[PDB]
Subunit: 736 residues, 2 copies
């Protein structure tokens, strides 16, 4: 048997398997119990079966493997090959059983463990497959394919666990996946998004960049990265990121929408329109694209089409918060108080939102009417924003020994003014909380944990508002004040602060909040220290009066254009300068000029200026004009204050709604009530009267800065006293 | 407008003159421009550049400061200020200048890169001060502006290694290499991390790469030498460590590793020399001191008091820099469930196991509650068998691998251990530092070391009256407690298999053999074995030592034997056998076991006697020498204990002269031992229990 076995081995080494197999079979006939001849015969039979498999004789291979296992069951590789055959024909139970038996006979044959793991993974049993790979690597820790499959399974498991809400375990699984494969793009991208979701943007960026580096075709990573840079106001990088995403996936609807948004912010209106329309074509059910289209139309002054786009969004997504709030905001630009339809719409939206949220019902605030009071101001606008020019007044002038100030800053990107506010608040003993990216319900929990007395929301239905916090009713008194000129539609909001001129006692505009009228002006402008000097009246050097307006375009309704055309026709050799951010786009400028021409006014006189992002020169630009014409039915607020502070008389119009009467309030309280028109005809008459005299106009210009500084509009202390008294009255009301 | 245009043209003229080498004329034209326009920033930028070129950094700073004041949107000026401050060492002002630069120009790639550099240097500084978390934060901020800044990734790897986040450290070292393949340090650290995970092949790859980048990297040379030592490539390890020593003569750890290699290779004298060099470089090197003591134990006949002096000195100093406890809440009760902790890292298939298993198997739990402190690095079926055996009887098993020593002592205190028994000694991965803390009221050493521990804090050493006779002259430290019977209870494995027929009966020649490790086979034992083999016609010696896997050691030993008068053909050198069964069966290859001196076998002698291979031993004046005397006498073979080399030779010749008697004795030896006190588990358990009780009584008194 020994000689026959060695002859068979020698024949096998030459690959002449047939005679070797015959020799081994003869040896088995000579001495069956010779277990080494049996082992060699099983080996040769398995080699024959493998050759037959590779030759396509799969059934003959099966037969040879069964023969081998009849000769030497212990021969694990025959079980391995049988398992492979069972797997290819999808007999997964037979395959797994064969692999398990092979692993019993040979527990160090890693490749079987890997194949079991792969098969189980294809069946969605990620945990079992992972265990199989783990034991495989316990047998051999360098086997590549097994490391790669372990990384894949770990990433799939981390994603599965994360979608169940355990973000931390998902992150741990992704980190382990990168341990088994440090250049697995999927793991990196998943980590990037998990980190981004948990307010860790720097790491998120690094991860998205790595994911793109290792997998250039991860268009999703480029899109996400562009979004993250956009939120950091690095618009150029966002532009490149989205362009790359579209170079990999031209029809990537998300990149189309996001790039459209970025173009909208930059004022490139035509490009924004084109990209959002492409997004709609790519995904007709992409509601957010409709919302962004509505925003684009609103900024371009096409309010009707903006409302239509928001309505399309709300038919596609009834719960779209952004569409509803932007719709209400857009309606505020054109609906003058005649029909109580806007108020009903706000009420209906508020009832829907109050259904979408369960508020609190009790408060632990000690009901002492005379104790000090904790006032929280909550807003995303504690940066260089219009609202910032007014909230600065109370933050500086509160008596902090009686009204403890808490600031909830949701500012996406701080700046020197945010830091200035925090420094003032902290130096006077106030709490400052940055709450960007924190769930609204967690905001409500925080507000309740901070024991606030009066919560003042300053945003209303504008961008990045926190009305979800207000719906929880975390505080015992909720107020809106300056960010929005109409009712918010929240029954949980108790009061809206105004004055007796913005909302006369006989106002017919219905609102849910009780109006709190301050004795003076409800606004206290804090002038920028960079305002610089007043320039001489241009009329003295140009000989002609230049009217102007630095309001937005959504506020300049066709009717305003008609009235301005009447003004310019009634005053020979006069000019109009209009500065707004979307004039950069040539198409919008052209439509605006054509609209003015249709009213019979020669475009040449009209100077349309785009926006120049520079505070000092932005404020100094009022040296280019002589008389500001306010817009209606949405009066200016900050623009009127800036005009007055520069010495430029500003003519406003009175109407039936708060947004219309804000200009009346400011002008009357600064002492220029003779510049408040009641109707379009008086508006024209007042403008002509101002234009007819230039020396008195120059004296007025030279006096206006000092007049305003001496007025209630700049009397920070008096405003603070009045506002504190109002708050105390609210508190006493609460105690009763 | 004319003044502005003239200033512009004069500045262009000055720049051309500078590029033409007329630097002073350019400076003069720039000053003329600044007289025509004190606000023309480009002139200020030029002045700053030239002032830097002449290394007049203060004027450059002042000029770029006027440039900042005139207009706050000169990104280049802020960048240049940051570079200048970085050059002066100040990183705060540099960071601030770069921050302004990025505040006016965010996408300024140069300013991002320089900000990343400065942030990484600052993180390194802050980390060097102690605050590692802030260092990590600075490195992450660096990876924000330069996500591919390899140095930030490497330094993160370092910090995570210090933080013990080994998986993240691996990832960050691999990324560091990917973004900078010249970072040989990253390669080295990655390999180290992989070695610590018992993945030797990857570690070797990493070190070979580190050396392919930096051939004279001393650290990588040392680490690769160590890895080859673990793999047993003696010559390779030697060469590597020698190169490391040549690259850095103050790399103490390289000397320690060289000493370990020499000791494992049996070259004890030069191993001692290497440890002395290490202790010359670092005097508190725990590893060098303990390896030195262990190595001295292999060749030191009791003819001096230098070994005891060295042990006492080392122990004294060690304890000196070592806080310890001073009070115990252990109830002073002589009739209670005294808690006895056994602490050791070698519970797996190790020589000690074959003896410590006996008490674990036969120990009255209802009186001496046993707690096990297993510091095993890698467990196995035998570890699990021991854990199960202890547990099913009510013992407490605690795995303590990878826990700080002081925390081990604290845990022992919370565990209310009464008698703490250290079973390791001056070997490797010992916990003698825990013993120095004296966490338990009684400290005992028994089987892990054959000589004094030198620590005064250890109270007792377990022995018998044969290994350490009452009149022994060896001065030690601990109090000798002599058990009545053999201090050892061997429990044979269930893999010993049958005793086979006598070799001398079938092969026609007597074969001597030894399974002791090579470190114990001192030349003085080779000469004696050569005399034995010359005295016995047609004799064969079989030696199986690990280091023989390397052919160099085999050749050297064969040459040494040939120089002594023994034909190398007459010498059978066997390497390590992979499996237990056949390794144990290898006792069929010899007729007589030869014990070594001045360090006898312990486990090997018991194995030789269990397989039927009569053993000849030598008496001496040290425990390690007399262990063989203890075993043979207690088995009943005291007539096989020589008193001198001449008696050793005579006994070996006599045993070889009567093949018949040898065969009979071997056929009887297994049952003789099974009936002997060596295999009388109950009697040993009773003796050890009585000894513990006596120790406790002494303590309470």
């Amino acid at each position: 048997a020994c000689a026959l076995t060695h002859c068979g081995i020698l024949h096998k080494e030459e690959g002449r398997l047939v005679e070797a197999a015959e020799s081994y079979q003869k040896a088995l006939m000579a001495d069956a119990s010779y277990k080494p001849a049996a082992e060699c015969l099983a080996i040769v039979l398995t080699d024959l079966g493998t050759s037959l498999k590779l030759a396509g004789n799969t059934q003959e291979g099966i037969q040879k493997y069964y023969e081998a296992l009849k000769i030497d069951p212990h021969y694990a590789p025959a079980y391995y090959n049988l398992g492979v055959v069972y797997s290819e024909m999808m007999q997964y139970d037979n395959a797994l059983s064969c692999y398990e038996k092979a692993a019993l006979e040979r527990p160090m044959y890693a490749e079987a463990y890997c194949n079991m793991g792969v098969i189980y993974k294809n069946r969605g049993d990620l945990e079992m497959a992972i265990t199989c790979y783990e034991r495989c690597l316990a047998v051999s820790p360098n086997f590549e394919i097994a490391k790669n499959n372990m990384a894949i399974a770990l990433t799939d498991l981390g994603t599965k666990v994360k979608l169940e809400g355990d973000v931390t375990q998902g992150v741990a699984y992704y980190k382990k996946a990168l341990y088994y494969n440090w250049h697995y793009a999927d793991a990196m991208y998943n980590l990037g998004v998990a980190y981004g979701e948990m307010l860790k943007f720097d790491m998120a960026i690094v991860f998205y960049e790595l994911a793109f580096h290792f997998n250039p075709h991860c268009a999703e990573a480029c899109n996400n990265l562009g979004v993250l840079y956009k939120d950091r106001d690095n618009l150029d990088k966002a532009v490149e990121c989205y362009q790359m995403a579209l170079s990999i996936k031209p029809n990537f609807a998300q990149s189309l929408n996001n790039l459209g948004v970025v173009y909208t912010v930059q004022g490139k209106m035509d490009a924004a329109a084109s990209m959002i329309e492409k997004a709609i074509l790519a995904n007709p059910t992409y509601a957010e694209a409709f919302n962004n289209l509505g925003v684009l139309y609103r900024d371009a002054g096409n309010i009707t089409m903006a409302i239509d786009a928001y309505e399309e969004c709300l038919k596609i997504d009834p719960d779209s918060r952004n569409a509803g709030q932007n719709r209400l905001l857009a309606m505020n630009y054109i609906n003058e108080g005649l029909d109580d339809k806007l108020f009903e719409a706000h009420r209906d939206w508020g009832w829907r939102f109050t259904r979408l949220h369960p508020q609190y019902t009790s408060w632990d605030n000690l009901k002492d009417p005379e104790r000090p009071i904790t006032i929280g101001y909550i807003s995303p606008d504690f940066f260089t924003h219009s609202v910032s020019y007014f909230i600065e007044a109370p933050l500086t002038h509160h008596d902090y020994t009686k009204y403890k100030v808490v600031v909830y800053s949701a500012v996406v990107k701080a700046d020197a003014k945010t830091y200035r506010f925090r420094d003032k608040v902290l130096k006077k003993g106030g709490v400052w909380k940055d709450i960007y990216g924190i769930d609204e319900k967690k905001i409500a929990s925080m507000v309740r944990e901070d024991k606030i007395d009066i919560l003042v929301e300053l945003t209303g239905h504008t961008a990045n508002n926190k009305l979800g916090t207000m719906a929880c009713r975390p505080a015992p008194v909720q107020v809106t004040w300056i960010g929005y000129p109409n009712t918010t539609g929240l029954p949980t909001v108790d009061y809206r602060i105004t004055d007796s001129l913005a909302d006369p006692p006989d106002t017919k505009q219905k609102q849910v909040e009780e109006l709190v009228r301050l004795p003076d002006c409800f606004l206290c402008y804090t002038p920028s220290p960079e305002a610089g000097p007043v320039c001489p009246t241009p009329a003295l050097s140009n000989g002609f009066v230049t009217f102007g307006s630095f309001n937005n375009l959504a506020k300049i309704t066709p009717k305003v254009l008609q009235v301005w055309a009447r003004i310019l026709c009634a005053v020979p050799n006069s000019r109009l300068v209009v500065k707004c951010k979307p004039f950069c786009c040539d198409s919008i400028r052209q439509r605006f000029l054509t609209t003015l021409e249709q009213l019979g006014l020669e475009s040449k006189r009209v100077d349309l200026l785009p926006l120049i992002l520079f505070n000092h020169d932005h404020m100094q630009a009022y040296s280019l004009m002589d008389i500001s014409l306010d817009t209606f039915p949405y009066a200016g607020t900050t623009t009127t204050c800036e005009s007055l502070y520069m010495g430029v008389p500003c003519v406003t119009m009175a109407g039936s709604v708060h947004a219309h009467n804000v200009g009346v309030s400011l002008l009357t309280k600064v002492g220029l009530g003779h510049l408040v028109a009641k109707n379009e005809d008086e508006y024209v008459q007042l403008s002509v009267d101002l234009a007819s005299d230039v020396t008195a106009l120059s004296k007025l210009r030279m006096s206006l800065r000092d007049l305003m500084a001496g007025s209630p509009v700049c009397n920070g202390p008096s405003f603070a006293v009045g506002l504190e008294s109002a708050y105390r009255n609210m508190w006493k009301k609460y105690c009763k």
